[PDB]
Amino acid sequence: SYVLKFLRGQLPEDLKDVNGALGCLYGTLPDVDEFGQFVISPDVVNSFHQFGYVKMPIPVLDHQQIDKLADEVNELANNVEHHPKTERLYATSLADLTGGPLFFCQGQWRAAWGMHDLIYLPTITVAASQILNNSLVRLWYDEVFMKAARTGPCVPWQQNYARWQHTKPVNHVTVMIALDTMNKDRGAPCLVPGSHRWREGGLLPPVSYDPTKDEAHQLNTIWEIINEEEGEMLMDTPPVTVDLRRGEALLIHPLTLFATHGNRSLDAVRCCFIHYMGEKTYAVQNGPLLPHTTKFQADAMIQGPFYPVVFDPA
Template sequence: MHTSNLLSKDDFEFYQENGYWISPKLISDEQLEQLRLSMDSVFNGEYTTGRAPWSNWSGGPGLRQANNSHWADDTIRQLATNPQIGEIAATLLAANSVRVWHDQLLYKPGDPASQASANVGWHQDYFFWQCAAEPTLITAWVAFDDVTLDNGCMQAVPGSHKWGLCNVSDFHEQDLQKQDEALRKSDGRTFAPVPLNMKAGQVSFHHALTFHGSGPNVTAAPRRSLAIHLMSENTRYKSGTASEDNIAVILAKPNEGELFAGDCFPVAYERG
């Protein structure tokens, strides 16, 4: 196993046991300020590259999201392909290189009176990515703001990456309590989420099978972030799955068993 200067043996073992790990602060305050401005520009339809993201949608008063925002903004692309983040992801995946699968620019608005509308239901990312033959993927979630339970930080279920694919994911579910109760009864497993409290500039990494979600932002300020979905060099296409409409397949559909590669999936890190 290779380790980077920011990932100790204990950190690696924590990830293997729990399915997630939180880094120290990797993104400077100056970079964060520029990223917040870039987010505003993308959501306003102003693209420094001249190219729109894959999608740019708002769920009414709820969560706002742009997919493949790295197409639209150079500052966001620099973050999506950040070699430091990429090296950590490669280490956690036991890979020699990682590519960007896609990204999600996420804006959770603040509403002190709300208990829903911008929640993210409990889900495993791989549920939506089954066009990848194996769950050889990881998400690096970059906090643009300090995050706690008050503003809807991500919550993860330790050890759930060892459960396999559970087929009960629902990203858009707003009633987390109902979903929580159903999952607690599922196969007698212990469903005990923990909040991933983070400072702006920290990055959380989670396995593609780790159950995670987030509750309401009951503060007056938005919660802003970029989810960078990364894959190892061994990620191959599998046809006939429920995720054939995935961005990755639409962008560059390989033949059965071929690697996802090429310009559609920029390299974030390559060892050596």
């Protein structure tokens, strides 16, 4: 077609169509023979496979990049001048146009710069490939959480794969990145060590969510979904909260029991979840996996513009 002279430098309507990654945060991706620098130690992989989660030794982003990424989150929940490309999100907490004390966004990698760049970050993608038995890494989807000051709620105990039942094999990993300093008083993760090998790699029954109640009861709902032996290993190794810095990341298994604390600080707290999947991932039904996405059929290999390949060890 003819792109007008003042529209030649524009970008696609949704950043899904942007093949590759823009150079905004860390420039361009390294060369094919330059991907060996971001490899992680085998002890980190062993710790992930033993505990069900692991904290990467080094922060993944510089402070200026974290500031820019937090500005993207701050502008993704404007509620006055709503974000451009808001329709390019799988879900939003502001669909009601009011929001609340908790802001959650999904599929923001198609809406803002930096967030689209964060998907192709080598530091986390190489580690995800190593976790996934050195295979192709494909984005599953994104998620952004923002809890307000003095009133932010807490997300109770949950299993990630319990929301991904339409994907056949368990071949997933979660990377959670703290865009702000976190603690037990503001959005720190609370994971159960060794909880990904409890029900023979199965899924625990969903927890009962009763809002408008204190955080202690919300975090104490664990004793209602476990059985006697799981009670014993919970007695032996109680849930542990991980303190995260301004850029530190955390790898989480899909089957690991996981919750987030509430926000009692004087400022909002932000975090970003990115879900990755391997090459050998299939669907179970006929239809789309996400709202307004490419539809697959039967046991169809999950691929397309909505699930880009972010790393290839070949």
